[PDB]
C-alpha cells in the first residue's frame, strides 16, 4: 500500500529527462527502486541527470536519442534491454510545447505531433514486445501543457489522450497498463527566471491550490500510476493542474 | 515514502459499513489517519471501528441517513467533537441504479437526494472546518453511469453527472479555502456482496471488452482514494480518475 | 425548404412569455406550428399569443409553474384539449446565470423537463413519434447550483434519448451562453460584458434568435437522425 | 426561405465525388451556393458537377491529393478564380480506418496527413481569403470514433480526435476574422457505398444500440451540414454535432 508505491526489480525508459518533468519523474522511480534509462535529446542533460540519481543511490543509465527518428527510438530500446535485461515501464515526455499563431509554417504544426503523438506511438510499439515477454508492464505518456493560439499542441494532446483510451485495448491483452498525464500550472524553470519579489509575495496571499505545483507533484503521479497501486487502471488522462 | 501516509489527519468516510468504503476507511485508518466511520446502520459501522482498532487505528463510529440535513450536521459535529477537526471527507454514501422512464418522480428525486444534494451539503458543512486548520480534500466515488448512455438509466445517470460535476466546480470555490476535491468512478468491484452473486460464467460476460482482463478488488479503489486525499495528490483536483481495467463491465 | 418547416405539428413551449422562449414560440408559428405558450406569468404569456395571432394565428395560452407537478399535469391536459396531438416538446429552464437555492436550479433544468417528458411521451408514443429539446440555464459566481443541474441535464438528454427512442421520440438539449434581449440588464454593466466579449471568438452576444434558429433545426425532419446531442449556441465560449 | 440558405456564398467541398460530400455539395449548390466539387479523382468531381448543372446549380471541378501541400494550394487558387470569394470550406476527404497496433508507423502517419494535416493547411490557405469578405464558415466530417474507445483502432481514432480538437482550437483563432468552425461525426450512413454490401441482417446487427431504429442518409448529414454553414448558426462555432440516431452503429 505505500510498498505499492516502490518498483525495487522494475525496468523503466524516461525521454525527456534532462531536464524539468522528466527530469524528476527519473529521480522519483529511481529513488523508489527502479532501473532507469534517462533519454533527452542532449547527451549532457541525459548525463547530469543520471550523477544526481547514483549520487543518491538508485541504478540509472544516459542515452541521447532524438524522438523523432525511429531508428534512434529502435537504439533507445535496444540500448534499455541491453543495459536493463527487460522494460517494464515505459515513461515518455513530450516537452512544455506552449503557444504558437495560426499561420505557422507546417513543420511547426508537424512537430508537435513527433513529440506528442508518434515517437510516443512508436517507443510504445518498440517496448510492448518486452514487456509481454515478462507478463505484463505499464506504459505512461506526460503530454504538453487557455484556447487561443494553441492549434499544433491543444491537437497534438487530444490525439495523444484518445491515443491512450485505444492503446489500452490493443495492449490489455498483452497486460499491459496505458496512462496519461496533462500536466497544468506547474512553477517551470521559464517561469522562475522570469518571477520578481513583488510577485512571489502577491501569489503567497492565494491558497497553495491558487499557486503553481511543483514537477515533483507530476512526479508523484507518474509514480503512483506506474505502480502496483494502480494495477487496474488503464485508459485514464490524469489532469494535474491544481483549482485555478 | 511519507507523502501517502495521512498521520494526524481526520478523515469522515460516509457509507464505511461495507464493500468500497469499509476499504477506504481501513486504508486510511492503516495509513496513519483518524477515521470516524460513518453508515446508515450502527451496527456494521461497528465492526469496521472494531476491526481497525484490533489493526492499531484510532476510529469512531457514528450512524447518518445523508438523506436528513440535520443527521449531516449531526456528523461533523460528531466529527470535530471526536478528532478536534477534519482533513479529509470520503463522500461514499450513495445508490439507485436501473430504473424505468415512467418511474414515480418521487423515485427519480431519491437518486438526487443521495448522490446530489446529500453530497453538496456535506461539502458545504465540512469545508469551513478544513479551511481553519489550512485547508483539506474532499473525495466523492461517483459512477462510470455518469459518462455512459444507455436504456433504463435516466435518475441514476443524470444523478451521478450532477455528482460529477459538482466535483470539477466545488474544486474552483473550495480553492480559496485550499481545499482539493475529486471522484473515483470504479469499475465492476468483485466485493464480499459480489462474490455470493458472480458465478463463473457472468465473470467472462462482465469482463468481455475490459483489456485488463480481470474484475477490481476493494484494495484497488482504496488505493486510489489513498493517491488522492494524500500530499502525493497536492496538485491534483477537480478530477474524476476511472479505475475499471481500461473498461465498463455490463450486468 | 419544407423539411425545416412544422406546418401540421403542434408544440408546447414553457418559459415562453420573454426572452429565448417567446423567440421560439414566435419562430415555431411562423415555421407553421400551433403553440401552447406557458409561462410563470399570464400576462406576458397572453402578450406572445395576440402577437403570434397578429402574425398568422395559432397559439394558446397557459399560465404554469414548472416546479409543481399539478401545473405541469394541467399544461398537459390543457395542452391535449386544445391541440388534439402533441408532436414536440421545448422545455426553456428559468435561470439567469448568477440549499433550497441549490435545490431550485434542478426543478428548472431537470425535474421539471424530466416529468414534462413523462406526461408528454404518451401522446407521443400514441401518435407515432415526436421530438423533445431542453434549453438548459444560460449558466464563476453563484453557478455551482446550475452548472450541476445542467450537467444532470445535459447526460439526462442522452440516457433519455435511449429511453425515449423506442417510441420513435427524439431528444436534444441547447445549451446556451450570454444572450441579451431578455432582463440580462439586470447585472450585465458595461464591464462584465466586455469580459464576455474577450472569451467569445465571434465578438457578438447571443440574440435570442440564435437558440430558436437552432431549436427549429432540432425540432425539424432536418434533425430526423440527431438524438442525446447537446448543441453549445455560445459564439465559440467554452463551459 | 431567409436563414437557410446560401445565395451569393461560394463553397470549396472535399471528398465531394461521393457518399456524405457528394450530397453537401448537391444540397448547398440547391440552397443557392456557387460550389468547387473536389475529389482526388477529377472524373468524380465532374460526375457531380453535372448532377449539380442539371438541377440549376453553378459547380466546378478541381481536383486535390488533400496529402500534398502544392494540390491543396493548387485548389485555393482555383476556387478563388472561379468563385471570386471563399465563404465557406466542408472538409471531407480523409480515409484511414482500424489497423492493428503493431502497424507500419508509415500506416499511422498517413492517418495524420490524410484526417489532420490535410484540414489544417486548408484551413490555414482559405482563412484570409475568408477575412477578407468579413468572415466565412469551415465544416469538418470528423468520426464518433474520436469519441469511441475500442481494439485495432490507434491510427483512425487518434487521428479523428486531432481534427474534432482542432475544431474548438481553429474556432477561437478565426472567431477574430469573425469565421465560424464546426464539424459534424456522421453515424454510419446508407450511402450506395453501403447499400451494395448491406445484408438485411448486418443493419439489424448495427441498430442494436440505436434509439431512432434507422441508418442514416447522405440528407442528414447534408441537412445538417446546411445549418452550420448557414446564417441560422452564425453564433455557432468550436462544436462537433453528431448525428447516429443518439447510438453507436457496430460491425463489432
Redesign the interface.
Request: overall charge neutral; aromatic content about 10%; charged content about 15%.
Given at each position: 500500500?505505500?510498498?505499492?508505491?516502490?518498483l525495487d526489480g522494475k525496468c523503466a525508459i524516461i525521454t525527456g529527462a534532462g531536464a524539468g518533468i522528466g527530469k524528476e519523474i527519473a529521480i522519483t522511480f529511481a529513488t523508489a527502486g527502479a532501473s532507469v534509462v534517462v533519454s533527452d535529446i542532449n547527451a549532457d542533460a541525459a548525463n547530469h541527470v543520471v550523477d544526481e540519481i547514483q549520487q543518491l543511490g538508485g541504478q540509472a543509465f544516459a542515452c541521447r536519442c532524438d524522438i523523432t527518428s525511429?531508428q534512434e527510438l529502435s537504439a533507445l530500446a535496444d540500448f534499455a534491454i541491453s543495459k536493463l535485461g527487460k522494460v517494464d515501464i515505459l515513461v515518455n515526455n513530450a516537452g512544455g510545447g506552449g503557444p504558437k499563431?495560426?499561420?505557422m509554417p507546417?513543420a511547426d504544426?508537424?512537430r508537435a505531433?513527433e513529440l506528442n503523438?508518434?515517437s510516443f506511438?512508436?517507443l510504445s510499439?518498440l517496448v510492448?514486445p518486452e514487456m509481454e515477454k515478462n507478463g505484463g508492464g505499464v506504459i505512461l505518456t506526460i503530454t504538453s501543457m487557455k484556447?487561443?493560439?494553441?492549434?499544433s499542441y491543444?491537437?497534438?494532446?487530444?490525439?495523444?489522450?484518445?491515443?491512450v483510451?485505444?492503446?489500452?485495448?490493443?495492449?490489455?491483452?498483452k497486460?499491459i497498463?496505458?496512462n496519461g498525464i496533462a500536466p497544468?500550472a506547474i512553477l517551470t524553470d521559464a517561469l522562475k527566471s522570469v518571477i520578481t519579489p513583488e510577485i512571489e509575495q502577491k501569489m503567497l496571499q492565494h491558497?497553495?491550490?491558487?499557486r503553481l505545483?511543483?514537477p515533483q507533484?507530476?512526479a508523484?503521479?507518474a509514480?503512483?500510476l506506474c505502480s502496483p497501486?494502480?494495477?487496474?487502471?488503464?485508459?485514464?488522462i490524469?489532469?494535474?493542474?491544481?483549482?485555478?
Open positions: 500500500n505505500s510498498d505499492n508505491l516502490r525511429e499563431p495560426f499561420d507546417m504544426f508537424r505531433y503523438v508518434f506511438f512508436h510499439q510492448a484556447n487561443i493560439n494553441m492549434t491543444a491537437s497534438s494532446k487530444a490525439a495523444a489522450s484518445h491515443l483510451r485505444n492503446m489500452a485495448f490493443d495492449l490489455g491483452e497486460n497498463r496505458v497544468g491558497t497553495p491550490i491558487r505545483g511543483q507533484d507530476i508523484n503521479a509514480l503512483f497501486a494502480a494495477s487496474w487502471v488503464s485508459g485514464q490524469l489532469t494535474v493542474s491544481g483549482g485555478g
